[PDB]
Amino acid sequence: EITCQENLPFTCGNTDALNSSSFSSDFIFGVASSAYQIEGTIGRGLNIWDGFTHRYPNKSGPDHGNGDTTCDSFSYWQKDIDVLDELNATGYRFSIAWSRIIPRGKRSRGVNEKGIDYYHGLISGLIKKGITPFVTLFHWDLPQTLQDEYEGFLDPQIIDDFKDYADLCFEEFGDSVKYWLTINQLYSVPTRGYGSALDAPGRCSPTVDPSCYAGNSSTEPYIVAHHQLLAHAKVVDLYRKNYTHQGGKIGPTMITRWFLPYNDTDRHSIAATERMKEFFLGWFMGPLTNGTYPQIMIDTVGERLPSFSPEESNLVKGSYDFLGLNYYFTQYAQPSPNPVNSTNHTAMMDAGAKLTYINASGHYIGPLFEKDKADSTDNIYYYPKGIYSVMDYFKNKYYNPLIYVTENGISTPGDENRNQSMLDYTRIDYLCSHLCFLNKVIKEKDVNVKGYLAWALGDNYEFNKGFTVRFGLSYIDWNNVTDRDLKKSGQWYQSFISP
Amino acid sequence: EITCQENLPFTCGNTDALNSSSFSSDFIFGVASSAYQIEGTIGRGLNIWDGFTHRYPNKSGPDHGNGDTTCDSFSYWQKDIDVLDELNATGYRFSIAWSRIIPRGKRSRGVNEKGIDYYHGLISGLIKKGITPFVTLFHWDLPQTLQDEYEGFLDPQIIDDFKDYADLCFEEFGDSVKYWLTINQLYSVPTRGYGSALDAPGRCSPTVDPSCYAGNSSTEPYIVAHHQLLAHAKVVDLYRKNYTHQGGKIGPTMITRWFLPYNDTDRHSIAATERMKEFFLGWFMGPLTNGTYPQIMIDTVGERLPSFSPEESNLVKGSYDFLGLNYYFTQYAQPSPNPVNSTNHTAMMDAGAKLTYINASGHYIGPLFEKDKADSTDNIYYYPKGIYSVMDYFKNKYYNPLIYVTENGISTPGDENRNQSMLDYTRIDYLCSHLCFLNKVIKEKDVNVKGYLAWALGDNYEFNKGFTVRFGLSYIDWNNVTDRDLKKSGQWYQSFISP
Numbered sequence A, B: 001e002i003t004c005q006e007n008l009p010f011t012c013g014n015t016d017a018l019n020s021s022s023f024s025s026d027f028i029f030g031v032a033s034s035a036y037q038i039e040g041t042i043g044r045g046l047n048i049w050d051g052f053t054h055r056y057p058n059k060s061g062p063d064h065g066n067g068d069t070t071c072d073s074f075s076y077w078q079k080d081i082d083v084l085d086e087l088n089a090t091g092y093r094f095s096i097a098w099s100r101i102i103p104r105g106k107r108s109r110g111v112n113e114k115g116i117d118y119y120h121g122l123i124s125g126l127i128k129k130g131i132t133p134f135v136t137l138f139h140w141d142l143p144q145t146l147q148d149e150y151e152g153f154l155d156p157q158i159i160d161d162f163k164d165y166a167d168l169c170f171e172e173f174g175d176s177v178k179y180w181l182t183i184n185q186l187y188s189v190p191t192r193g194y195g196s197a198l199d200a201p202g203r204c205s206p207t208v209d210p211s212c213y214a215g216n217s218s219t220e221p222y223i224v225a226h227h228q229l230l231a232h233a234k235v236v237d238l239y240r241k242n243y244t245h246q247g248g249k250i251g252p253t254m255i256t257r258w259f260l261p262y263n264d265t266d267r268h269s270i271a272a273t274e275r276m277k278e279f280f281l282g283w284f285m286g287p288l289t290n291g292t293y294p295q296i297m298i299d300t301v302g303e304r305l306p307s308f309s310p311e312e313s314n315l316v317k318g319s320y321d322f323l324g325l326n327y328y329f330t331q332y333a334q335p336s337p338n339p340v341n342s343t344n345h346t347a348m349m350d351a352g353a354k355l356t357y358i359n360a361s362g363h364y365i366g367p368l369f370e371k372d373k374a375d376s377t378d379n380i381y382y383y384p385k386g387i388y389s390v391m392d393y394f395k396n397k398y399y400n401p402l403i404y405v406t407e408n409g410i411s412t413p414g415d416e417n418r419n420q421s422m423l424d425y426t427r428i429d430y431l432c433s434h435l436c437f438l439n440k441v442i443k444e445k446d447v448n449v450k451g452y453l454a455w456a457l458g459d460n461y462e463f464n465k466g467f468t469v470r471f472g473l474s475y476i477d478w479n480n481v482t483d484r485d486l487k488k489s490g491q492w493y494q495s496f497i498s499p
């Protein structure tokens, strides 16, 4: 029987009690990254994360930091492989920058052969060290040209441009890459890029944020979500019909959270919790498993929710070989009004729920996850059992999918000095406590999880936070980015993988 | 009789001998800037100078510097006006960033009202202090979307997009702006952007620079030059037909140089010198005054030189109310081969001339202009009399135009400390020695020059050089860009203007 801790102190950092041997022999362990966050702009065209961070610098991070140079994995990709090799990792998730291989967005305008070569060298280097690539085609970094021509995922023109981009990736790299991810965290761009305008491209209703250049927070998240699902599905169809000879697998990436009732004896909080599962996970998993949005979304969102044609429904339904599930934290849910007529209405209000980390009796859900210095009542707290709950829910609700955990990690403050940053025991605690629950759910519930990739390989530009927080298992000095030095967490992870 | 010095030491810094009263009472004196170089990216879309400096950082400057924040004239435009007001300047040349007012390039995609407001406030502030705006519509910063959709000025689609942009500027600002410049230094983008790939967008033939993403250095400079002339001319027609009620004037900006023979008794050097005038100035002034390219260009460039239709010729011919002439230096010319079949052929080789600052008997043309630390045989030297020669030539060759000197200045090294940088006596010398010759040419040759704008108001990002050189008459600390402090040159210029 497996027992896992939910509260500090944790004792799962002892590799005598928890290690890779605890899991099936074929289980993949590694780390993850994304292109905007690690490569730098050298050698590529411009994308909407360059555009957003430069047009709205105070949205890029408190330090106004951006991905212009970052950890320079364009130059130091070999050093990333060296970190992986030190870990004895068997998997690495990275993304391809669309703007590095088709800087002009539309494939017919030409490809960047040197960009293609960059990824060929990285892939070859990873395979030479026994590391399985998991490659994300779209980690938010849409070529700026496409956003300027037709507002990117707001328009159905995105579907064929994304399809032609993915075709080029399959053609050039699919002889070596056998695990493909289409779109990173489906929920994120619709809500943060087109709802709150916290993320690129930065569109929203005027009264939500007067800095937005255009938008409508009530309608555009649904349009963009719909186009993401159609673009994803068109790429999966292309993969499975035209690249079956490569013997690989493809899927979307979901951001997952668990939800608990803020008051577990209050039917209204219980109902808000179930609505959050549908509006946060079902928004995408309904279409991916059934070709339709959840009924509560149909009913609430009404004319603002697009319909799938029969052909579209068929395309989307079943459009995955596996799911990449990212998981960071869980929230309590309580009822909240949905003021659809308010000029500041957002799609996120349609779930009729307010989300917290503290429940009605004052209990904080778990240990600190992210401190908010401007506002400590906005601190985020984590919940190790949430990974168990999420995976169990996916197996039961969503037809026993094949899953890879494609991100899981925690930040530490950028104000810490190097010595403090390397002594990242809070990261060991976070990662081990989740891995314990992951092993427990696989054993107890027989969820088909076959790998785990921790966020992140190294310190990098964090969306929205610049360099004010660090997520790496390896440390990068921003005054001299060449080296990636394993922190205590990376050293622990090395021992967990090879105990 | 006016006597001007050509060699150090100069004595024209004494405002008892040379001042604004030396010139006609209506003569305009001020300084100049450009948008990419001073504003920062905040509040605007991305353009090809953002794209180039980020994709090819070692081309942006030795320091890899770029216009991301620069002197932050987006925030500190009032401080620029304050410098002008301190100088008692009567003119200021600045540019409008296309990407700030139509971030999506094509006007039908929407305008950025806050961008429009920025320029309205600057213009209102300048007029309130008695400063005449001279506004450049295009100072090289083409929206990146247009370069990605159709390669910008390489395609005739640029004509109508530039026309719709200029129409918006006339409509919004032309009630207050009465001097408009269309395209900055016509020669520069064709040659450096599409020939040598030293400037954005960075296209060239493969063997010229293997880093170029695409191009053909032999053909594309001529295509882009031709489209610049047509786009310019379409905007001048629009101005003069639709905005005559505003009572303003419009013209192109030329970069001018004078040319002297490397050996003034050698007919081959003399012929190269005359070919350089035609290929450097006549390439654009032929079409602007006659609707045709110079005959030597027709003969040499052959099928690589586009033709104007009769309608186009008529549109281009006479398409100016005045000329903005930038002038920095003069070169000696000697013959050089034109290897049109070489894979590394460039349009710049078609003139059949090699350019130097030292003549055949070893004479350096004048005082140091720009030191090249990697290569001192590549140092640039200036020649005060060249401004006299250029203006005389324009009056005689090009039909006695109305001229404003829209740039003239000199850099000092970014390695100098603040105290050295403020003690910029070499800049006083450069500016005064040119102003003496300018006054002399106006008096002796009756050239219709009506203003002079020194480059630059303040230190800024210098194209190709980052922050490794300074051009300002006012000093900016890159660790805290708010203040613009008048250097010795700015203090001198203040006394020259109000003696």
Ligand SMILES: *[C@@H]1O[C@H](CO)[C@@H](O[C@@H]2O[C@H](CO)[C@@H](O[C@@H]3O[C@H](CO[C@H]4O[C@@H](CO)[C@@H](O)[C@H](O)[C@@H]4O)[C@@H](O)[C@H](O[C@H]4O[C@H](CO)[C@@H](O)[C@H](O)[C@@H]4O)[C@@H]3O[C@@H]3OC[C@@H](O)[C@H](O)[C@H]3O)[C@H](O)[C@H]2NC(C)=O)[C@H](O[C@@H]2O[C@@H](C)[C@@H](O)[C@@H](O)[C@@H]2O)[C@H]1NC(C)=O
Residues within 6 Å of the ligand: A286, A290, A291, A292, A293, A294, A295, A298, A299, A307
């Ligand atoms: C999995 O996908 C299946 C579909 O492949 C989902 O089942 C479909 O569920 C929908 C409701 O979402 C049912 O549609 C309703 O059909 C009524 C019956 O119509 C048929 O007979 C008529 C009925 O009197 C008639 O006019 C119609 O032309 C047919 O003959 C409808 O009136 C409903 O429309 C009203 O409600 C809509 C909102 O739900 C609203 O948008 C409409 O304006 C209308 O007011 C609805 O009809 C749908 O109307 C919209 C139009 O775009 C659609 O094409 C139209 O079908 C389907 O009948 C049902 N299909 C079948 C094959 O069962 C399934 O839904 C789950 O299961 C069903 C049983 C139900 O419990 C759902 O609530 C639950 O979500 C999806 N499963 C999951 C887990 O989501």
Ligand SMILES: *[C@@H]1O[C@H](CO)[C@@H](O[C@@H]2O[C@H](CO)[C@@H](O[C@@H]3O[C@H](CO[C@H]4O[C@@H](CO)[C@@H](O)[C@H](O)[C@@H]4O)[C@@H](O)[C@H](O[C@H]4O[C@H](CO)[C@@H](O)[C@H](O)[C@@H]4O)[C@@H]3O[C@@H]3OC[C@@H](O)[C@H](O)[C@H]3O)[C@H](O)[C@H]2NC(C)=O)[C@H](O[C@@H]2O[C@@H](C)[C@@H](O)[C@@H](O)[C@@H]2O)[C@H]1NC(C)=O
Residues within 6 Å of the ligand: B286, B290, B291, B292, B293, B294, B295, B298, B299, B307
């Ligand atoms: C100012 O603009 C005026 C034009 O508005 C320039 O004058 C034009 O100059 C051109 C040369 O550049 C002369 O064109 C030549 O005309 C010959 C005579 O053709 C006429 O009679 C025929 C001749 O036997 C016949 O086929 C033709 O159809 C006419 O009836 C031509 O053969 C020349 O073409 C050869 O040379 C071309 C290169 O110059 C080459 O490109 C052609 O393939 C061809 O091999 C040329 O014809 C021109 O051919 C190209 C085609 O695209 C043009 O439409 C075609 O005209 C013009 O006759 C002359 N026009 C007039 C009204 O004078 C003027 O040029 C300057 O002055 C002229 C006198 C001359 O000295 C030029 O060398 C000098 O540049 C421009 N001024 C300035 C300062 O540039």
Ligand SMILES: *[C@@H]1O[C@H](CO)[C@@H](O[C@@H]2O[C@H](CO)[C@@H](O[C@@H]3O[C@H](CO)[C@@H](O)[C@H](O)[C@@H]3O[C@@H]3OC[C@@H](O)[C@H](O)[C@H]3O)[C@H](O)[C@H]2NC(C)=O)[C@H](O[C@@H]2O[C@@H](C)[C@@H](O)[C@@H](O)[C@@H]2O)[C@H]1NC(C)=O
Residues within 6 Å of the ligand: A263, A264, A265, A266, A267, A360, A361
């Ligand atoms: C978890 O949710 C439960 C279920 O909602 C909360 O328990 C309920 O709390 C209500 C108070 O918020 C109770 O109602 C009150 O009852 C007293 C005694 O009769 C009465 O004087 C009140 O005015 C009020 O009555 C309601 O008034 C509004 C009407 O519309 C409604 O019909 C009335 O019921 C309610 O009885 C109670 N329900 C149950 C099943 O116990 C619970 O609140 C916590 O426990 C209750 C017992 C009470 O001690 C609250 O102070 C305490 O917050 C909530 N848990 C937490 C931690 O918030």
Ligand SMILES: *[C@@H]1O[C@H](CO)[C@@H](O[C@@H]2O[C@H](CO)[C@@H](O[C@@H]3O[C@H](CO)[C@@H](O)[C@H](O)[C@@H]3O[C@@H]3OC[C@@H](O)[C@H](O)[C@H]3O)[C@H](O)[C@H]2NC(C)=O)[C@H](O[C@@H]2O[C@@H](C)[C@@H](O)[C@@H](O)[C@@H]2O)[C@H]1NC(C)=O
Residues within 6 Å of the ligand: B263, B264, B265, B266, B267, B360, B361
């Ligand atoms: C400025 O340009 C002028 C004109 O080109 C240069 O003067 C010319 O310089 C040529 C040497 O480069 C002279 O030709 C040489 O004459 C000597 C004496 O006869 C002879 O032995 C040579 O082999 C050579 O002759 C030429 O050989 C090549 C043949 O194709 C051609 O037909 C022959 O002429 C030439 O006479 C001379 N021309 C004139 C009008 O003086 C001038 O060069 C400078 O001055 C000359 C006098 C000489 O002292 C050169 O050493 C000195 O560089 C050049 N000025 C400069 C500073 O470079």
Ligand SMILES: *[C@@H]1O[C@H](CO)[C@@H](O[C@@H]2O[C@H](CO)[C@@H](O)[C@H](O)[C@H]2NC(C)=O)[C@H](O)[C@H]1NC(C)=O
Residues within 6 Å of the ligand: A205, A206, A215, A216, A217, A218, A219, A303, A304, A343
């Ligand atoms: C968001 O777009 C929606 C839909 O175009 C706008 O909502 C409509 O508001 C129009 C004008 O009031 C109403 O007539 C419709 O009944 C509403 N339609 C629906 C589907 O709700 C909404 O006003 C726009 N929001 C912003 C801030 O522009």
Ligand SMILES: *[C@@H]1O[C@H](CO)[C@@H](O[C@@H]2O[C@H](CO)[C@@H](O)[C@H](O)[C@H]2NC(C)=O)[C@H](O)[C@H]1NC(C)=O
Residues within 6 Å of the ligand: B205, B206, B215, B216, B217, B218, B219, B303, B304, B343
């Ligand atoms: C530049 O473009 C020119 C014109 O397309 C190319 O020049 C031609 O080369 C083609 C192939 O040799 C020849 O058949 C033509 O006779 C040449 N045409 C002319 C107008 O010169 C040139 O090769 C391209 N340069 C590069 C480096 O691509």
Ligand SMILES: *[C@@H]1O[C@H](CO)[C@@H](O)[C@H](O)[C@H]1NC(C)=O
Residues within 6 Å of the ligand: A015, A016, A017, A018, A019, A021, A022, A499
């Ligand atoms: C691995 O952990 C298991 C418990 O899951 C333990 O029994 C085994 O001894 C550990 N391996 C090592 C080498 O410590």
Ligand SMILES: *[C@@H]1O[C@H](CO)[C@@H](O)[C@H](O)[C@H]1NC(C)=O
Residues within 6 Å of the ligand: A055, A056, A057, A058, A210, A211, B043
């Ligand atoms: C941040 O930037 C936007 C302009 O992009 C501005 O509207 C807002 O006032 C600034 N935020 C703060 C809190 O200063």
Ligand SMILES: *[C@@H]1O[C@H](CO)[C@@H](O)[C@H](O)[C@H]1NC(C)=O
Residues within 6 Å of the ligand: A237, A238, A239, A241, A242
């Ligand atoms: C498959 O590739 C072929 C050849 O390029 C193409 O005709 C077909 O449309 C593609 N298919 C998809 C997405 O099925």
Ligand SMILES: *[C@@H]1O[C@H](CO)[C@@H](O)[C@H](O)[C@H]1NC(C)=O
Residues within 6 Å of the ligand: A342, A344
């Ligand atoms: C608008 O929304 C903010 C956040 O959604 C909220 O605090 C405020 O009450 C809202 N105002 C109106 C008029 O609804």
Ligand SMILES: *[C@@H]1O[C@H](CO)[C@@H](O)[C@H](O)[C@H]1NC(C)=O
Residues within 6 Å of the ligand: A480, A481, A482, A483
């Ligand atoms: C930067 O870091 C690398 C790796 O440690 C080191 O070899 C190099 O000398 C360092 N550069 C400077 C300027 O210190």
Ligand SMILES: *[C@@H]1O[C@H](CO)[C@@H](O)[C@H](O)[C@H]1NC(C)=O
Residues within 6 Å of the ligand: A088, A497, A498
């Ligand atoms: C690498 O992991 C393999 C598989 O568990 C193990 O056999 C090998 O010893 C490990 N290598 C190192 C250096 O830890």
Ligand SMILES: *[C@@H]1O[C@H](CO)[C@@H](O)[C@H](O)[C@H]1NC(C)=O
Residues within 6 Å of the ligand: B015, B016, B017, B018, B019, B021, B022, B499
């Ligand atoms: C201005 O310079 C002129 C010579 O051009 C001189 O005669 C006049 O006195 C000077 N003005 C002052 C105030 O020094």
Ligand SMILES: *[C@@H]1O[C@H](CO)[C@@H](O)[C@H](O)[C@H]1NC(C)=O
Residues within 6 Å of the ligand: A043, B055, B056, B057, B058, B210, B211
């Ligand atoms: C500068 O950058 C380009 C890539 O953009 C590269 O090809 C070239 O080698 C670099 N130049 C030098 C001298 O290092």
Ligand SMILES: *[C@@H]1O[C@H](CO)[C@@H](O)[C@H](O)[C@H]1NC(C)=O
Residues within 6 Å of the ligand: B237, B238, B239, B241, B242
């Ligand atoms: C003038 O403006 C009118 C009205 O918009 C337009 O019809 C006409 O085409 C414009 N003209 C130019 C460039 O002459």
Ligand SMILES: *[C@@H]1O[C@H](CO)[C@@H](O)[C@H](O)[C@H]1NC(C)=O
Residues within 6 Å of the ligand: B342, B344
């Ligand atoms: C190519 O050009 C460089 C500069 O133009 C020159 O030094 C070299 O000789 C040229 N080579 C050939 C093959 O022409």
